[PDB]
């Protein structure tokens, strides 16, 4: 009974991060020791003529980006664990997330290490026009 959500290539990393005190650090350390990034993400087919904003209602990838389903790029959603927010809710689930193509091989790692500028809505160091 039931429907599988995952593939065997992710079993080890998801199990490791599902038990860690610090899941984000466990994911970073897993990669630093030669582990493969989390796969089976939700990648979108789009026109690549979007606004390029980091988190959006519909896919908004520009020519330097790829669009992905929000929950699929969130380590906490992927491992089914607590979100580090005060209210425990997710900022990615229910939205699309734009990831630079040069970081699209590891979208979970990208969202863990990067920050969205609250003023322009773009990733810091990957499109932010503020400073």
């Amino acid at each position: 009974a039931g429907n599988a959500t995952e593939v065997p290539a992710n079993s080890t990393v998801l199990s490791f991060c599902a038990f860690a005190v610090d899941a984000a650090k466990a994911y970073k350390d897993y990669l630093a020791s030669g582990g493969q990034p989390i796969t089976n993400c939700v990648k979108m087919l789009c026109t690549h003529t979007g606004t390029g904003q980091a988190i959006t209602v519909t896919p908004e990838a520009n020519m330097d980006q790829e669009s992905f389903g929000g929950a699929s790029c969130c380590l906490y959603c992927r491992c089914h664990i607590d979100h580090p927010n005060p209210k425990g809710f997710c900022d990615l689930k229910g939205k699309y997330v734009q990831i630079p193509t040069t970081c699209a091989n590891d979208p979970v790692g990208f969202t863990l290490k990067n920050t969205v500028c609250t003023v322009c809505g773009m990733w810091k160091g990957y499109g932010c026009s503020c400073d």
């Binding site: 959500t5 079993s11 005190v21 979108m44 607590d82 997710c90 229910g94």
Partner: protein
């Protein structure tokens, strides 16, 4: 190629919207085209779902620098025999709003302790994973009849894990710097550990030089068995699966070959006592 780990146990007839699905496999078929997924104008997200996610199928076979191995060899286990605590869990099945997974009900230890938990699972929602009470029933059959009154005698998991830490601390503080869970067919015991175990790099206690064996979510601090009062999680435990040593039949038949003083009283703590007793006879007797 798929795994049972994180299997969606809901009875919803469709998959998820691309923004809410945790994986490409879980996205509904209607969004799949040309190898990937598409957003369909007019097809909205689901804002009221409750999807039970199975915690069966953990694989603790990683090799990450500075993080210890949970599963240890027979030789390492023998050196730490004073840390041995037999562990067994009797489960209840998800029912009504979900089907396809086992939830811990009775947690038994070789100390003679049985702890009863409220049937609790990990429920995916539009906003987060809700760790909550779920509908459940004991498995059918005269062998599982004893689990029926336990369905309404459970304690919330936040209380159960505190009691596990307190019991392990009282038992092991003057015996060992660690815990070695002695298991027989580890699958469901490793699933139950998700409810009360945290892992990470080897740490030291907040009040002494001993290695940390406990973690507190209240202060994000670490403690040894002597200083863990009020702590809610077991940190970096070790474990071994006795069944993987060459035994063929069930636990009781293998235990009975060496021992007669532990009559099977059909309860989680008895299976945990039999498991530790069998491992002790195999490794230290004759």
């Amino acid at each position: 190629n798929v795994t049972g780990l994180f299997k969606d146990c809901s009875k919803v007839i469709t998959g998820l919207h691309p923004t809410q699905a945790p994986t490409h496999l879980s996205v509904d078929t209607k969004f799949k085209t040309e190898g990937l997924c598409v957003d369909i104008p007019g097809i909205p997200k689901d804002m009221t779902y409750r999807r039970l996610i199975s915690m069966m199928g953990f694989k603790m076979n990683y090799q990450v620098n500075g993080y210890p191995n949970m599963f240890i060899t027979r030789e390492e286990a023998i050196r730490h025999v004073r840390a041995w605590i037999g562990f067994d869990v009797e489960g209840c099945h998800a029912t009504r709003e979900a089907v396809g997974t086992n939830l811990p009900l009775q947690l038994g230890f070789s100390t003679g302790v049985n702890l009863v938990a409220v049937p609790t699972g990990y429920v995916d929602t539009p906003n987060n994973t809700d760790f909550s009470r779920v509908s459940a029933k004991p498995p059918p059959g005269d062998q599982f009849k004893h689990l029926i009154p336990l369905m309404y005698k459970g304690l919330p998991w936040n209380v159960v894990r505190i009691k596990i830490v307190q019991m392990l601390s009282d038992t092991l503080k003057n015996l060992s710097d660690r815990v070695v869970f002695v298991l027989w067919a580890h699958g469901f015991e490793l699933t139950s550990m998700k409810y009360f175990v945290k892992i990470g790099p080897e740490r030291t206690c907040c009040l002494c030089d001993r290695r940390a064996t406990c973690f507190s979510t209240a202060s994000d601090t670490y403690a040894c068995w002597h200083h863990s009062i009020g702590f809610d999680y077991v940190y970096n435990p070790f474990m071994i699966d006795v069944q993987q040593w060459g035994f063929t039949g069930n636990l009781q038949s293998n235990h009975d070959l060496y021992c007669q003083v532990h009559g099977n009283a059909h309860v989680a703590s008895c299976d945990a006592i039999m498991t530790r007793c069998l491992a002790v006879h195999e490794c230290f007797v004759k």
